Amino acid sequence: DLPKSVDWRKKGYVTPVKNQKQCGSAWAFSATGALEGQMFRKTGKLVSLSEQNLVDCSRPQGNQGCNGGFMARAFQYVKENGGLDSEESYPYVAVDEICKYRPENSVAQDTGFTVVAPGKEKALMKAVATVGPISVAMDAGHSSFQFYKSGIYFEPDCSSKNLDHGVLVVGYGFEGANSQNSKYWLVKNSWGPEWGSNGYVKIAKDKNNHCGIATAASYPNV
């Protein structure tokens, strides 16, 4: 009984597209994006969250800052730390720096996170429909993705198991009148608004877990 389409951007859950620049911090942007949606669902206030706070401070939890990391380890950091600072108060500079977490500037918290049944696009569809934006890993390691500009993205060389890039599923939809025709996942990237379609990409949906979008999906518990 899930909706034919979902787009959380239309309900105020999603901040404008950000840019990680030359830092392997996509996992931090995916995590802040999912926490931004859950915090909005809880309080009605959309507050941009600090990726730099995660880059600089979550090494104990197993992240490696600009050398990579994982969204579940970032949600683990926010839980163990008791908070996460706003983007305004702890700005992004795209380089590993000293941890400067300030509890008085915290605007978010989580108690851990929930994992979507791995490899199941229908499970991911249910989480997107009932929770809000969901953090996901994908295989983005292709020039077709770097130069992606519009339309549904399908890449034959995509893997659903060996992934390399965290992104945020903000909804799903279809092209035209038939809800089961030309389906896609609405994905927010962190390569800036100029990349792709206003910083977003439509990834083919119900095409065998294309690019691994439902392989490692999760969301923070607020």
Numbering used by the authors: 1 to 222
Can you list sentences taken from the study reporting this PDB entry?
Addressing the elusive specificity of cysteine cathepsins, which in contrast to caspases and trypsin-like proteases lack strict specificity determining P1 pocket, calls for innovative approaches. Hence, we set out to determine the crystal structures of cathepsin complexes with representative peptides of cleaved substrates. As a working model, cathepsin V was chosen because of the resolution of diffracting crystals (up to 1.3 Å) and crystal packing with accessible active site cleft. Reactive site mutants C25A and C25S of cathepsin V were used in structural studies.
The pattern II group (binding shifted to the non-primed side) consisted of structures of nine protected peptides and one non-protected peptide that all bound uncleaved into the non-primed sites. Electron density maps of the peptides enabled the unambiguous interpretation of residues from P3–P1. The nitrogen of the amide protection group at the peptide C-terminus was bound approximately 3 Å away from the ND of catalytic H164. The amide likely shared a hydrogen bond with the deprotonated His residue. At P4 and beyond, the features of the electron density maps became weaker and less precise; however, it was possible to model the peptides KPKKKTK, RLSAKP, GNYKEAKK, and EVCKKKK up to P8 in the averaged kick Fo-Fc omit maps. MPD molecules were bound to the primed sites of all structures.
